[PDB]
Ligand binder design. Structure first.
Ligand SMILES: Nc1ncnc2c1ncn2[C@@H]1O[C@H](COP(=O)(O)OP(=O)(O)OP(O)(O)=S)[C@@H](O)[C@H]1O
Ligand SMILES: Nc1ncnc2c1ncn2[C@@H]1O[C@H](COP(=O)(O)OP(=O)(O)OP(O)(O)=S)[C@@H](O)[C@H]1O
Ligand SMILES: [Mg+2]
Ligand SMILES: [Mg+2]
Lengths: 495, 259, 572
């Protein structure tokens, strides 16, 4: 391939002339180290240095990659594997077609399963058994001492929930990692893989090379700063987050607080203190409860919705299933562990069986889930905030019975919710007028009846910026908390 | 002396451990050397004694602070600096990589003992190891200021909205160029292009905002970017041969003019 | 390749012969002649040679062994065989081949640390045996195939334990059992398997270690790993008159109050001395603790701290622990399809501690298998035509919640807990914790909690009045006390305990031998705390006090006042 030689020469040119300091000289010198054998190259540098080479590499990556490795070896020997990053286009798994074979593209997905490290033979030195002729440098089409071996890892990935179209089964893709890419991915994580889609004998397999997990624009930064100085920011956020819901602002404040969340702390004894908030809502059917769930689901991209009775114990935390090809037992992820570092919403929590809530128990407080079933021993992280909705035992809150009698929930379950709101429906004329006018105005004036103080994207950016701070507790706050808790605990739901 | 004898013994242990680690293309880290010495001699190992060695015979090793050291599944973060030790050995004339042979090991321990004897003939201060890198009047004044600022903001809000978008255009232009490079197509629909740009942009935005940004790009820069109305849809065609730096300069000039 | 040269090969063979017949220990004794005499007396087929002595004497051999293992080991086996023939010509009649075993390899590597660079190299590894095959003959020999997983204590949380295969020949056959912690020295070789190549779609080699030396990982190695500085610190702590106070105060610094529960858990952790009188019956030296408490007392925090502190610890939940999961079960191998045993949680808890959370959630069928391991500390598996016995010497700590969520003081302890009487009887220490509204206790709790919250911020990162000990020092003290002390009960007054037991019978029929046994092993453990070879009666007094406190806490309110009045002599 003459164009491959041209690409090799141009890659040498890029390695030798890119700058006022050449970025890759130190990396190439570090490539001499035995533990370092892959070079990371930015795609934006390649495209800005020259365009024909960038397009050729983007179009014939498989054709010129071994020539790229030859160029890298030549450059290093004058004083090995090539990895690429920062491709500006993201693609979906459902977009993967046969027309894209050989193209350098990067795919986003969530890792569900992993396989152990295997040695892969690239070039083998063969000894003939008839004439004792040593045949060296024999490539493999998919003497051990003088042959070359490369570490391998097999990764099974699953489509992300957001990209999943309604009513569709999330398809799975196999990912091959070699050399430094081995063991760089962990099960249950969401990663972006840069590479190509190869044809395995047919079969579809993606070969990857790299993995993925102050600089903000001036106007966005200044808008965040200016809005951070608003004195009525709390009430404005409360109004803007629920423009179409009338009253019940206490629930709005509570859900906003649990969106902010606290800080987790790990003691010197290795014990971790939960920095999240769990909220339960119990109310008469009239009061809107599922609307809050839908709003928090559509606003937060990291939110998961599920029904009460339709969910089993295995489907929530995890299940143990025997793998067909491996003839072994593996673990399939549940809803709770997929909502890691997010929020999980449960509707009709009362209809759930006790056999399911007892499984929820561990994830509620200890924030982790452990499985000891059928010779499989593991513990999994369940760092989630739970928002639960339920109704009283009877559809109507009967005041002829005590408060404790009206809620059919276990004592630890009652205790492990931080905020517990109970809604009672009353017949008031002014409330009826307000609710009716709001509903009819929404039904007739869909868009012009919405006045949002801040944009949803702006709120999301502010929330992302705010969550990374870890405030300190003052001594005045310390003794104030002491005295407040003194007064509070001195008075069903024990404190 | 007893202290110097212990120094020599642990120096021999250090040399053996470094030789074992280096002979198999493995980078000798401080933790592994400490573990090996502690197993070999049942004695505490610490950086002060290494600094004492460096004071005695600095030519034994080169000490560096390095990152990106793979510690297997130990949960070690990448930002954790690690102190590495590289043996300083004379290069042979045979052309092979230097190896700590038993002859060199004996030579090194003998040289260390000779240095100790010379020091006695004259505690050792450790060498500095390389460290890792009225209220009414005020209210009326405030009301006057508010009225003046309100008269100031009677100007159309859209004027500043376009200015806001003008800063966002160059990066979006680069993204659009990359998308058209990736798609191998001369023309694309509004829906697919906007969806891909949103799914690849660094800022979360609505499809309508992307449509208005595309319209602004078309109106400002018609020669690069052309729009064609076909049936019930508008398709996007771009010239891929244009220089991106010149386009960025033109966009900067346009933004400056609009200011 | 250089070793394959005939000249150096033969010269090294004779050099190894001279090393065998010439080495002198520090005491002036040729050790290998004593070893060969012992092996001849025992008619064994393997010889054990220390790698340290060989490295000290011949550095070139120590360099060559990891690099050319197979050829050099075969040469050394032939040299040993001919040396034996020269020394014991008749020994050819009992054995035809003798193998050389290499022990104490300085380089110890984990299963996770295995790479391509270790291929066809001698590597020392440590782990726990999970499954083993039978003895298989070969048309050359004895064969053993075993499956080894990483030690659960060493495995970090959130990551599955990895498994590897090992091969044993001749003498090494049947040298280990499933569930036994061992360290191995062997050759990390690769195997050609076309099935893996077809399944994965490319050449894959299954790496299997061929072990050379097998050594079970008893705590003797841990004793050897102890620094003399650690020993002197432990001894200096032992001579302290207030060592017990600081030991009890050193447990759960983040938790306030609750002296009795931490006292009992520490006393169980130190453990007693198991005994096997006459080989007819075996007396356990283990303490079983059951913890029933009102919610809000941080029982799970105590269990988690115990999980972290213990050198060997396994944590299980009530919902996720099945009978098959907890115990060993028979399974057909997916590849070779013979019946295989996979060890349960309790089996991997052997010599360690097992923690059970929400034990009141246990299914009764799952409970049935528990009593056997509780009473005999061994499990007999009779399934699919395979009958095997496995050791279950573990300390079990179980957590439970009272029915209804609140402990009723007007009812017996048996009634408040949904467990059968034999299960409670198997337990040795019972501790009940209630929730009371005391303003001064509330002040203390709030102050301590807020102080702990201030202390343990990442940005910023007693009742007895004694300073808590460091965690590492406490762990080292626990290891040394477990592995050194063996108390003797030669100064016990049987009349006092007989009178106390008669009173116990009188006051229990108004409302057994294993209670006396638990008190005896409790006194043994308390003596082990102070590092005393013989038991002083103060240990007996403290054991009696804590046992009586535990017993009265399980009675109704209407009688505990009378019980305290009757036994005010011992409680004072
Ligand atoms: N404050 C309110 N503002 C606007 N609409 C409301 C308000 N309260 C109730 N509604 C209306 O009442 C409907 C009931 O909402 P839901 O959240 O589904 O009720 P619910 O309490 O969850 O009852 P269940 O649990 O689904 S049987 C909403 O969809 C709104 O149309
Ligand atoms: N005495 C205490 N001192 C300090 N912190 C405490 C104390 N009791 C409880 N806590 C705190 O309360 C948190 C929650 O207690 P839990 O451990 O969930 O209660 P519990 O007694 O184990 O009952 P369950 O099992 O949750 S129903 C713990 O993580 C501690 O931080
Ligand atoms: Mg609802
Ligand atoms: Mg608990």
């Amino acid at each position: 391939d003459e164009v491959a030689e041209k690409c090799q020469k141009l890659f040498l040119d890029f390695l030798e002339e890119f700058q006022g300091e050449i970025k890759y000289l130190q990396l190439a010198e570090e490539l001499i180290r035995p533990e370092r054998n892959t070079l990371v190259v930015s795609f934006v540098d390649l495209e800005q240095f020259n365009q024909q080479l960038s397009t050729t590499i983007q179009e014939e990556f498989y054709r010129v990659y071994p020539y790229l490795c030859r160029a890298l070896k030549t450059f290093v020997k004058d004083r090995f594997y090539v990895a690429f990053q920062d491709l500006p286009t993201r693609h979906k798994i459902r977009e993967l077609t046969s027309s894209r074979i050989g193209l350098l593209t990067r795919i986003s997905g969530q890792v569900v399963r992993t396989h152990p490290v295997h040695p892969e033979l690239v070039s083998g030195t063969f000894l003939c058994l008839d004439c004792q002729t040593v045949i060296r440098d024999v490539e493999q089409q998919f003497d051990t001492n003088k042959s070359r071996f490369v570490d391998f890892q097999k990764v099974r990935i699953q489509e992300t929930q957001a990209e999943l179209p309604r009513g569709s089964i999330p398809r799975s893709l196999e990912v091959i990692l070699r050399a430094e890419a081995v063991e760089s991915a962990q099960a249950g994580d969401k990663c972006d893989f840069t590479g190509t889609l190869i044809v395995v004998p047919y079969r579809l397999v993606f070969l990857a090379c790299c993995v993925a997990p102050n600089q903000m624009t001036v106007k966005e930064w200044e808008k965040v700063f200016e809005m951070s100085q608003d004195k009525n920011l709390y009430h404005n956020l409360c109004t803007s987050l629920f423009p179409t819901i009338h009253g019940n602002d206490e629930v709005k404040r509570g859900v906003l607080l649990m969106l902010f969340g606290g800080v987790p702390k790990t003691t010197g004894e290795g014990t971790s203190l939960r920095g999240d908030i769990n909220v339960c809502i119990v109310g008469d059917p009239s009061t809107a409860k599922s609307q809050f769930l839908k709003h928090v689901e559509e606003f937060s991209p990291r939110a998961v919705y599920t029904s009460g009775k339709a969910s089993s114990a295995a489907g929530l935390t995890a299940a143990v299933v025997r793998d067909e090809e491996s003839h072994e037992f593996v673990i399939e992820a549940g809803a709770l562990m997929l909502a890691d570092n997010g929020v999980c919403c449960i509707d009709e929590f009362d209809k759930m069986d006790v056999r399911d809530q007892v499984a929820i128990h561990e994830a509620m407080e200890q924030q982790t889930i452990s499985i000891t079933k059928a010779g499989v021993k593991a513990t999994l992280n369940a760092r989630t905030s739970i928002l639960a909705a339920a109704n009283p035992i009877s559809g109507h809150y009967d005041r002829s019975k005590s408060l404790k009698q009206n809620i059919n929930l276990s004592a630890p379950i009652m205790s492990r919710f931080d905020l517990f709101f109970i809604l009672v429906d009353e017949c008031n004329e002014v409330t009826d007028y307000a609710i009716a006018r709001r509903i009819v105005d929404l039904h007739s004036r869909i868009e012009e009846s919405i006045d949002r103080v801040y944009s949803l994207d702006d709120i999301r950016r502010y929330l992302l910026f705010a969550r990374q701070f870890k405030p300190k507790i003052s001594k005045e706050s310390e003794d104030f908390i002491v005295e407040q808790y003194k007064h509070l605990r001195q008075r069903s739901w024990r404190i | 002396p007893y202290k110097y004898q212990v120094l020599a013994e642990m120096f021999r242990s250090m040399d053996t451990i470094v030789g074992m680690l280096h002979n198999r293309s493995e980078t000798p880290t401080f933790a592994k050397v400490q573990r090996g010495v502690q197993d070999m001699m049942r004695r505490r190992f610490e950086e002060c004694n290494v600094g004492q060695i460096k004071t005695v015979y600095p030519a034994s090793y080169r000490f560096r602070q390095e990152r990106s050291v793979p510690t297997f599944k130990d949960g070690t973060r990448r930002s954790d600096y690690q102190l590495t030790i590289e043996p300083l050995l004379e290069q042979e004339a045979d052309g092979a990589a230097p190896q700590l042979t038993a002859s060199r090991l004996l030579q090194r321990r003998q040289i260390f003992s000779q240095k100790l004897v010379e020091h006695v003939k004259e505690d050792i201060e450790p060498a500095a190891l390389p460290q890792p890198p009225s209220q009414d009047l005020l209210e009326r004044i405030r009301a006057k200021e508010a009225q003046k600022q309100l008269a100031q903001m009677t100007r159309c809000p859209e004027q500043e909205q376009r200015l806001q978008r003008l800063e966002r255009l160059p990066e979006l232009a680069r993204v659009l160029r990359s998308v058209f490079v990736s798609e191998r197509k001369p023309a694309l629909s509004m829906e697919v292009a906007c969806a891909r740009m949103v799914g690849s942009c660094c800022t979360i935005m609505s499809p309508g905002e992307m449509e208005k940004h595309l319209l602004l790009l078309s109106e400002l820069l018609p020669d690069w970017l052309s729009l064609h109305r076909i049936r019930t849809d508008t398709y996007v065609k771009l010239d891929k041969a244009a220089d991106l730096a010149h386009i960025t300069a033109r966009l900067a000039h346009q933004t400056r003019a609009e200011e | 390749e250089w070793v394959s040269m005939a000249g150096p090969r033969l010269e090294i063979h004779h050099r190894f012969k001279n090393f065998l017949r010439t080495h002198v220990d520090s005491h002036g004794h040729n050790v290998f002649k004593e070893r060969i005499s012992d092996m001849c007396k025992e008619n064994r087929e393997s010889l054990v040679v220390n790698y340290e002595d060989l490295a000290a004497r011949e550095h070139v051999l120590a360099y060559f062994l990891p690099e050319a293992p197979a050829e050099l080991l075969q040469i050394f086996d032939e040299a040993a065989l001919e040396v034996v023939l020269a020394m014991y010509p008749k020994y050819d009649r009992i054995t035809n081949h003798i193998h050389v075993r290499i022990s104490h390899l300085p380089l110890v590597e984990e299963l996770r640390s295995l790479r391509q660079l270790h291929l066809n190299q001698l590597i020392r590894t440590s782990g726990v045996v999970t499954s083993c095959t039978g003895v298989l003959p070969q048309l050359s020999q004895n064969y053993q195939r075993i499956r080894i997983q990483e030690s659960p204590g060493k495995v970090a949380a959130g990551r599955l334990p990895r498994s590897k295969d090992a091969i044993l020949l001749a003498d090494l056959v049947d040298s280990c059992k499933p569930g036994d912690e061992i360290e191995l020295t062997g050759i990390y070789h690769n195997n050609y398997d076309g099935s893996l190549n077809t399944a994965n779609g490319f050449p894959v080699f299954a790496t299997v270690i061929l072990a050379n030396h097998v050594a079970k990982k008893d705590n003797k190695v841990a004793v050897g790993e102890l620094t003399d500085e650690d020993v002197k610190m432990i001894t200096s702590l032992s001579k302290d008159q207030q060592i017990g106070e600081k030991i009890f105060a050193s447990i759960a610094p983040s938790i306030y109050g609750h002296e009795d529960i931490k006292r009992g858990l520490a006393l169980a952790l130190f453990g007693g001395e198991p005994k096997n009188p006459g080989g007819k019956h075996k007396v356990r030296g283990d303490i079983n603790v059951l913890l029933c408490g009102d919610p809000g007392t941080a029982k799970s925090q105590f269990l988690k701290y115990i999980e972290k502190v213990s050198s060997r610890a396994i944590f299980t939940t009530g919902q996720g622990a099945s009978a098959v999961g907890l115990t060993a079960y028979v399974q057909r191998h997916p590849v070779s399809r013979e019946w295989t045993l996979e060890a349960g949680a309790l089996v991997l808890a052997d010599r360690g501690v097992c923690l059970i959370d929400e034990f009141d959630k246990m299914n009764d069928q799952d409970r049935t298998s528990i009593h056997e391991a509780m009473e005999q500390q061994s499990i007999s598996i009779s399934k699919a035509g395979i009958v095997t016995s496995l050791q279950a010497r573990c300390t079990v700590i179980a957590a439970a919640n009272p029915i209804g969520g609140r402990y009723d003081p007007s009812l017996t302890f048996s009634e408040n807990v949904d467990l059968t009487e034999p299960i409670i009887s198997r337990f040795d220490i019972l501790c009940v914790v209630r929730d009371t509204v005391d303003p001064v206790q509330d002040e203390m709790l709030a102050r301590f909690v807020v102080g702990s919250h201030v202390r343990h911020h990442p940005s910023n990162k007693n009742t007895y009045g004694v300073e808590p000990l460091p965690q590492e020092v406490l762990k080292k003290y626990i290891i040394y006390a477990k592995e050194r002390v063996h108390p003797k009960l030669n100064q016990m007054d049987q009349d006092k305990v007989a009178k106390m037991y008669s009173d116990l019978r009188k006051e229990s029929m108004a409302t057994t031998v294993r209670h006396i046994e638990s008190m005896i092993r409790m006194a043994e453990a308390h003596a082990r705390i102070h590092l005393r070879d013989y038991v002083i009666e103060d240990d007996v007094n403290m054991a009696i006090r804590v046992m009586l406190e535990s017993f009265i806490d399980t009675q109704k309110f209407s009688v505990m006042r009378s019980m305290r009045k009757t036994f005010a002599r011992y409680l004072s």
